Amino acid sequence: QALLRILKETEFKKIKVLGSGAFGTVYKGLWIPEGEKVKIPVAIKELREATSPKANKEILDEAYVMASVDNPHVCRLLGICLTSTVQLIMQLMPFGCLLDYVREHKDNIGSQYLLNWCVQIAKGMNYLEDRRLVHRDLAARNVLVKTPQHVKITDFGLAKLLVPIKWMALESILHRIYTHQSDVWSYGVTVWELMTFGSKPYDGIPASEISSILEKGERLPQPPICTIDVYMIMRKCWMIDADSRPKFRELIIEFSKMARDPQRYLVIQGDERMHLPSPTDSNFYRALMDEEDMD
Amino acid sequence: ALLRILKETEFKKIKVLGSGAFGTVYKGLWIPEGEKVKIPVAIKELREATSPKANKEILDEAYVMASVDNPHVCRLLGICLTSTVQLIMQLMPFGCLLDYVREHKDNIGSQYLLNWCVQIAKGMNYLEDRRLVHRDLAARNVLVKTPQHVKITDFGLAKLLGVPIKWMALESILHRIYTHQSDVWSYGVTVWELMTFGSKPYDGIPASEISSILEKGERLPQPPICTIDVYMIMRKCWMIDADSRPKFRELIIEFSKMARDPQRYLVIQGDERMHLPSPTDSNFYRALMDEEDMDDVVDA
Ligand SMILES: Nc1ncnc2c1ncn2[C@@H]1O[C@H](COP(=O)(O)OP(=O)(O)NP(=O)(O)O)[C@@H](O)[C@H]1O
Ligand SMILES: Nc1ncnc2c1ncn2[C@@H]1O[C@H](COP(=O)(O)OP(=O)(O)NP(=O)(O)O)[C@@H](O)[C@H]1O
Ligand SMILES: O=C1c2ccccc2Nc2ccc(F)cc2N1Cc1ccccc1
Ligand SMILES: O=C1c2ccccc2Nc2ccc(F)cc2N1Cc1ccccc1
Ligand SMILES: [Mg+2]
Ligand SMILES: [Mg+2]
């Protein structure tokens, strides 16, 4: 509705490449409101290839859906520009994606942060399930860091408009089946990424051979910091039978309980020197970079 | 809790935005320790106060400014007392409302002007609830977060440290009395600034002559776009009897009433296309730079 803004190409500018994925390239950009002098930082995603205006109508229809999400842990699509190559606008996250964040702060991340991130990602996916929106490309690279205390899911629904083998449920690899329960499989891999501080899953195994090892019962290994309870949640996300996997609602509760006693469920060297920010640092971050309400 | 104490090594001044009577404001960057991000901030290096102040006294006063909670009042965010007194607040890329109205002279619709009057009155009424006297209210001390959302700034600076004769109530000029009712006078001048698109009040008249012309009953003239209804509000703000002036609570009500029929109370050429932004453009502004939501815009 009024949730998605249609932008003129003349009101924004690319200033820096942030990266590229399977579906396009993301830029740091500036929005210049017409008739104003200000330059507002934004993220711009230029799709991999140019689309006909017939295809644009379909891109537009789904863009309205993605612009309609309202949840503190889900990124909302903000605008679109229907140039020959479609350009999409969302809020710029200066901290980048959670995968890069955990790699940059490897070891230096306390159990309180890791478990809270699992809670927040589960909340965002539970919301998407409520909307009947299947992500299809959940991974640590598609969780953005708004502040170190507040992460948000991005890039949902993109994959079905326009293949991350090592994050997909077996049935998605074999039969192109994508459901909320196959998203749960990808959730488990995302948690594994966090708990290993950004390790590549199935490192050294060709993607063409992942489905065979999954059929034989092979799974991602137990991260060194994960207790039996944390790793069992992850293993349950990877059950062959999709209906045997946990619900995102169940995951919220499980990780919330664990986050109330983090040192019991993650064993991290020097965890006693790491910290969840002080109310002083929490208020400062919010006023500067995060004024949306959240738990 | 509310006021962050900063190390000088976690922020840097980048550019002067301007200076007033109380210090210099910079566009700056906050660099969280152990992080790689650089977050734009506003940094104000205060000049020296005319009275001696201990570090604790400065901190105690800063905490009061950090404790305000209202959508139309800027909150002090951080402080660094090593070098000079340096304060950190949110950077407003649109700048102050005075510069904004001058920059969009004759291009501003009645809904914007009247809603700004509502929002400033709301912020001042909150400050009055907290017993905080501004002493330096003016269009330059209303900041634009978005064109739809303005916020009062720089309250309390004048009493912490050491000029704005043309914005001060008569009792402030003559006897240095500063109250919430003298703030109402300055509010009246601020409204006059907006309605004249940023004209200098008493232009070409020395400040030494302001009290004389006020005592003789002369006031700032009626802005061309103002109906008498709006101009009467300004005149009431400038009554010699301080207790006779409107209360900020009354100003909220009156200007909110006018904003429900904006073209009835302001006469602006081409006013019909200068409406408040569409729900599409409001959501875009809010998501990008104003997640505080509460624009507080009463609409025709
Ligand atoms: N809103 C954003 N703010 C800041 N950085 C972003 C934003 N969106 C994406 N990025 C980054 O831009 C780069 C490109 O992301 P993207 O194009 O989605 O590829 P990807 O997420 O790594 N792989 P995939 O999404 O599965 O195709 C990544 O480094 C992201 O972390
Ligand atoms: N938070 C802010 N974000 C952006 N610009 C700001 C901010 N605070 C102040 N400024 C601007 O920085 C300049 C310096 O402001 P300031 O030092 O308060 O002088 P002044 O407000 O014009 N006069 P006065 O406050 O009465 O002494 C002005 O151009 C302001 O508009
Ligand atoms: O590409 C997309 C995107 C495009 C079309 C349909 C769904 C999509 N999924 C999505 C969901 C929420 C969000 F907030 C951003 C996206 N994005 C990523 C994006 C968009 C603009 C700028 C940078 C990145
Ligand atoms: O100086 C001050 C300020 C300093 C001391 C006491 C009161 C003060 N009043 C005030 C109130 C709210 C606000 F949000 C900012 C201020 N400011 C202005 C400022 C601070 C940091 C950077 C730029 C400008
Ligand atoms: Mg992505
Ligand atoms: Mg000022």
UniProtKB/Swiss-Prot annotation, chain A:
Receptor tyrosine kinase binding ligands of the EGF family and activating several signaling cascades to convert extracellular cues into appropriate cellular responses. Known ligands include EGF, TGFA/TGF-alpha, AREG, epigen/EPGN, BTC/betacellulin, epiregulin/EREG and HBEGF/heparin-binding EGF. Ligand binding triggers receptor homo- and/or heterodimerization and autophosphorylation on key cytoplasmic residues. The phosphorylated receptor recruits adapter proteins like GRB2 which in turn activates complex downstream signaling cascades. Isoform 2 may act as an antagonist of EGF action. The active site is at residue 137. One of its GO terms (biological process) is response to UV-A. It comes from Homo sapiens (Human). Changing residue 19 to D: Found in a lung cancer sample. The chain holds residues 701 to 1008 of 1210 of the full protein. Changing residue 9 to A: Found in a lung cancer sample; more sensitive to gefitinib than wild-type. Belongs to the protein kinase superfamily. Tyr protein kinase family. EGF receptor subfamily. The modification Phosphoserine is found at residues 278, 282. It comes from the Eukaryota. It is found in: Cell membrane; Endoplasmic reticulum membrane; Golgi apparatus membrane; Nucleus membrane. Changing residue 45 to A/M: Abolishes kinase activity. Ubiquitously expressed. Isoform 2 is also expressed in ovarian cancers. Changing residue 48 to P: Found in a lung cancer sample. Keywords: ATP-binding, Cell membrane, Developmental protein, Disease variant, Disulfide bond, Endoplasmic reticulum, Endosome, Glycoprotein, Golgi apparatus, Host cell receptor for virus entry, Host-virus interaction, Hydroxylation, Isopeptide bond, Kinase, Lipoprotein, Membrane, Methylation, Nucleotide-binding, Nucleus, Palmitate, Phosphoprotein, Proto-oncogene, Receptor, Repeat, Secreted, Signal, Transferase, Transmembrane, Transmembrane helix, Tyrosine-protein kinase, Ubl conjugation. This is Epidermal growth factor receptor. The modification N6-(2-hydroxyisobutyryl)lysine is found at residue 45. It is linked to Lung cancer: A common malignancy affecting tissues of the lung. The most common form of lung cancer is non-small cell lung cancer (NSCLC) that can be divided into 3 major histologic subtypes: squamous cell carcinoma, adenocarcinoma, and large cell lung cancer. NSCLC is often diagnosed at an advanced stage and has a poor prognosis. One of its GO terms (cellular component) is early endosome membrane. Binding of the ligand triggers homo- and/or heterodimerization of the receptor triggering its autophosphorylation. Heterodimer with ERBB2. Forms a complex with CCDC88A/GIV (via SH2-like regions) and GNAI3 which leads to enhanced EGFR signaling and triggering of cell migration; binding to CCDC88A requires autophosphorylation of the EGFR C-terminal region, and ligand stimulation is required for recruitment of GNAI3 to the complex. Interacts with ERRFI1; inhibits dimerization of the kinase domain and autophosphorylation. Part of a complex with ERBB2 and either PIK3C2A or PIK3C2B.
